[PDB]
Structure 1
Amino acid sequence: ARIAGVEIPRNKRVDVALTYIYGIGKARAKEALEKTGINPATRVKDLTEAEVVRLREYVENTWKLEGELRAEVAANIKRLMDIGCYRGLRHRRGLPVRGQRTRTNARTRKGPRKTV
């Protein structure tokens, strides 16, 4: 599990690879490679273990990633669900939360169609 908890794609440029971490998108990819002075274009197979632990150390301390991140988002939802607010209710019934129409669509949230 090289970095950071996840084994990022070798053969790929380090900036693109880093996005294969939960919590690290393209924005944060360009950030960590500056702050550690590593060429963003270089492939993960071509990193130095010096650079790896360099890249590793910064990325794992600056931001919340993978497990602990998922834990929070859930707790945040678990919270809204428990305090019983409207946003909460939508999560409890698995319905859309950001005020979308549910007469049609809402399939991403509802899942594939249930016959009647």
Structure 2
Amino acid sequence: ARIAGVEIPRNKRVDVALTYIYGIGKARAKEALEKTGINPATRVKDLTEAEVVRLREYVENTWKLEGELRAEVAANIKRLMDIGCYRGLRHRRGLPVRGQRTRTNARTRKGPRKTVAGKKKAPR
């Protein structure tokens, strides 16, 4: 059941199985099931060799899709190394690119806490 390259769902209701593709979520899933006219309550376990090909036809041909989707976004972040837009940086310093408070959180874009400190107050 290897529709996209290294990607293979199985024994789960196909509707959400197709989620298990980079470039495919609940939306582009349901969208394709009516157009292929297949009951999503059915499992990857069980279906015609025709059903399978019918599905991979529609999907792989329409949009993209792990590999060259993934490779595409990167080249767009790459192009923000032009003369260097604002969104170019933030990508350069791995910080929030979307106008936020760095003073506190941001941990999702910043690897867990580099506590590193040695500040002082009064001895005498």
* Cα 1:16–1:93 shift into 2, 3 Å: same
Q: Confirm or deny: 8 A CA contact 2:2 2:9 kept in the other structure.
A: no
What is the RMSD of the two structures over their aligned residues, measured on CA atoms?
Answer: 1.2
Gaps of 5+ in 1: none
Query: Residue deviations 1:39-84, cap 9 Å, x none?
Result: 1111011122111110001100111100000111000100113341
Query: Distance in 2 between the 1:44 and 1:100 partners?
Result: 43
Q: After superposing the two structures, state which structure 1 stretch, 67-76 or 7-16, moved more.
A: 7-16
Moved over 3 A (4+): none
Q: After superposing the two structures, state which structure 1 stretch, 4-13 or 84-93, moved more.
A: 4-13
State TM-score, norm by structure 2.
0.88
Query: Distance in 1 between the 2:78 and 2:41 partners?
Result: 40
Query: Distance in 1 between the 2:7 and 2:61 partners?
Result: 18
Q: Confirm or deny: 8 A CA contact 1:16 1:29 kept in the other structure.
A: yes
State TM-score, norm by structure 1.
0.94
Q: Percent identity?
A: 100
Structure with higher helix content: 1
Counting matched residue pairs gives 116
Gaps of 5+ in 2: 117-124
- Give the number of the structure whose alpha-carbon radius of gyration is greater: 2
